[PDB]
UniProtKB/Swiss-Prot annotation, chain A:
The gene is S. The lineage of its organism: Viruses, Riboviria, Orthornavirae, Pisuviricota, Pisoniviricetes. Binds to host ACE2. RBD also interacts with the N-linked glycan on 'Asn-90' of ACE2. Cleavage of S generates a polybasic C-terminal sequence on S1 that binds to host Neuropilin-1 (NRP1) and Neuropilin-2 (NRP2) receptors. Interacts with host integrin alpha-5/beta-1 (ITGA5:ITGB1) and with ACE2 in complex with integrin alpha-5/beta-1 (ITGA5:ITGB1). May interact via cytoplasmic c-terminus with M protein. May interact (via N-terminus) with host bilirubin and biliverdin, thereby preventing antibody binding to the SARS-CoV-2 spike NTD via an allosteric mechanism. Attaches the virion to the cell membrane by interacting with host receptor, initiating the infection. The major receptor is host ACE2. When S2/S2' has been cleaved, binding to the receptor triggers direct fusion at the cell membrane. When S2/S2' has not been cleaved, binding to the receptor results in internalization of the virus by endocytosis using host TFRC and GRM2 and leading to fusion of the virion membrane with the host endosomal membrane. Alternatively, may use NRP1/NRP2 and integrin as entry receptors. It comes from Severe acute respiratory syndrome coronavirus 2 (2019-nCoV). This is Spike protein S1. It comes from the Viruses.
UniProtKB/Swiss-Prot annotation, chain B:
The gene is S. Attaches the virion to the cell membrane by interacting with host receptor, initiating the infection. The major receptor is host ACE2. When S2/S2' has been cleaved, binding to the receptor triggers direct fusion at the cell membrane. When S2/S2' has not been cleaved, binding to the receptor results in internalization of the virus by endocytosis using host TFRC and GRM2 and leading to fusion of the virion membrane with the host endosomal membrane. Alternatively, may use NRP1/NRP2 and integrin as entry receptors. Changing residue 11 to H: In strain: Omicron/BA.1, Omicron/BA.2, Omicron/BA.2.12.1, Omicron/BA.2.75, Omicron/BA.4, Omicron/BA.5, Omicron/BQ.1.1, Omicron/XBB.1.5, Omicron/EG.5.1. It comes from the Viruses. Changing residue 7 to T: Reduced host ACE2-binding affinity in vitro. Changing residue 25 to P: Increased resistance to human covalescent sera neutralization. This is Spike protein S1. The lineage of its organism: Viruses, Riboviria, Orthornavirae, Pisuviricota, Pisoniviricetes. The chain holds residues 495 to 543 of 1273 of the full protein.
Length: 24, 49
């Protein structure tokens, strides 16, 4: 079988805190 | 290399060590000696963390 993720597999690219900031 | 003791310089064996300092994204690691110290507050200071 195969299935569809929707919005899955997002990890914090590294340390360094951060707040409201649409960071790219 | 067929090294032989009666070789002119530039054909004698040299040993080499290459140190490569890398900085991933951890919290810290090895370093020189330093001395460390306490820490004030509100006192414009020159700091190294």
């Amino acid at each position: 079988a195969y299935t569809n993720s929707f919005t899955r597999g997002v990890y914090y690219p590294d340390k360094v805190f951060r707040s409201s900031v649409l960071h790219s | 290399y067929g090294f032989q003791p009666t070789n002119g310089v530039g054909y004698q064996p040299y040993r080499v060590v290459v140190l490569s300092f890398e900085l991933l994204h951890a919290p810290a690691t090895v370093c020189g000696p330093k001395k460390s110290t306490n820490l004030v507050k509100n006192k414009c200071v020159n700091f190294n963390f």
